[PDB]
Ligand binder design. Structure first.
Ligand code: BTN
Ligand code: BTN
Ligand code: BTN
Ligand code: BTN
Lengths: 119, 119, 120, 119
């Protein structure tokens, strides 16, 4: 259910393949921030989720360097996939920028992204 | 400097290889929680960091399923590598469990782990 | 604007008064968790926000002890009030439970609540 | 009662607090970093009947970063627990939200962790 194209509330595009082995691989294109075009992502998901009606835990990382620019930053998304008619991936994320030690207190943004199969 | 065996303040063991393509690959073994033995990890890091004294941004994911146990959960660590005489990786993390829709409000733990190469 | 009765996406009820010099005071009633009835809250907000369309920063705390039970925990909400035709308070929160040192790694839940004045 | 007094975190900030019998926290905060000058009002709450099994005492407080000297249009909340004894600490995680346009709301919130000691 996870493999495919997903869109969050910002209009970013998350292209992912879920491997039989628990791997997530794909590309991420952000609608905002110091980013242009596609970035590599890799992550992991629970390939044998609970028998009951529970979400499928997952996470992935983008480092914001590609052939066009380098923001010296990385975002990790941690969340769960929920299938069905209005399938969603509900996430919280941490975006860490490379900082000097003096500025490390302000290195990390936190937020939440909800991904759907429709824009 | 990222490639190696790292330990956090809980005693967990993070074995990682940093590839020239920006990939992080390896295994994680937690000293705590619903976990036993090693788990696959994958992540990304900035392969061309700033040269101005800033750390190197990175992130990785563990889904807590292996051949022995499945916690139906995933952790993402977002942080930066700080080089020096005593290299360190400073992270914040998000641990999401698969939940029902009604219990989604309590799906995600947050914390912070600091890693060094001192066993 | 901020003063009023607010409800989040869980159906929890946030009754707050914004004071002239930056105080937030009121009661919180959670629809979920180890909680029943109302709890005291206190917080702070920016009483002189920007006038450029930016939201109004604010935050508050609940310790989850009242006359009926005590969860040995506290939540803080950090967020901003967004004025307009549909007033909204958008927050992220941290819920810390009192733990032993050995369990401190799992002391804190994180989430996000959005509040409106629409009664469920 | 162990909460009442002057605390310092790892940044050099000073946290001056009084714990009321009813569960109130009141005092002042002076940050060593950020868009901040002199003391700011804080208010918060703590568990005034904590467990007696060696667990910490849950607490939180808020600073809005306006005082008579300046206004950063931001607020921080600290959520954590007090741990007593010879090496007393208040261990926290925090969320700092800046007032933003809706277009920039995705980057409104910084997250971190502060450890307060009596020294
Ligand atoms: O500005 C940067 O340093 C890189 C781009 C950051 C984009 C963030 S990642 C979290 C949030 N979700 C998105 O789809 N975009 C932003
Ligand atoms: O309990 C689970 O659901 C799986 C084990 C989680 C262990 C967490 S991940 C964050 C923290 N850092 C560690 O080294 N262990 C814990
Ligand atoms: O279970 C507890 O320890 C006390 C109740 C916590 C309820 C939380 S606070 C964050 C979220 N928002 C709500 O309205 N309820 C939950
Ligand atoms: O820059 C601002 O908007 C106001 C100052 C923020 C200071 C933060 S609060 C979290 C962290 N802990 C501190 O003691 N200072 C910083």
């Amino acid at each position: 259910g996870i493999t495919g194209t997903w869109y969050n509330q910002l209009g970013s595009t998350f292209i992912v393949t879920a491997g039989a082995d628990g791997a997530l691989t794909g590309t991420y294109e952000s609608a905002v921030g110091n980013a242009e075009s596609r970035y590599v992502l890799t992550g992991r998901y629970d390939s044998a989720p609970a028998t009951d009606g529970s979400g499928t835990a997952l996470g992935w990382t983008v480092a914001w360097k590609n052939n066009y620019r380098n923001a010296h930053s990385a975002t990790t998304w941690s969340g769960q996939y929920v299938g069905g008619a209005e399938a969603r991936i509900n996430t919280q994320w941490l975006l860490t920028s490379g900082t000097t030690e003096a500025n490390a207190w302000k290195s990390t943004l936190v937020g939440h992204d909800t991904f759907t199969k429709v824009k």
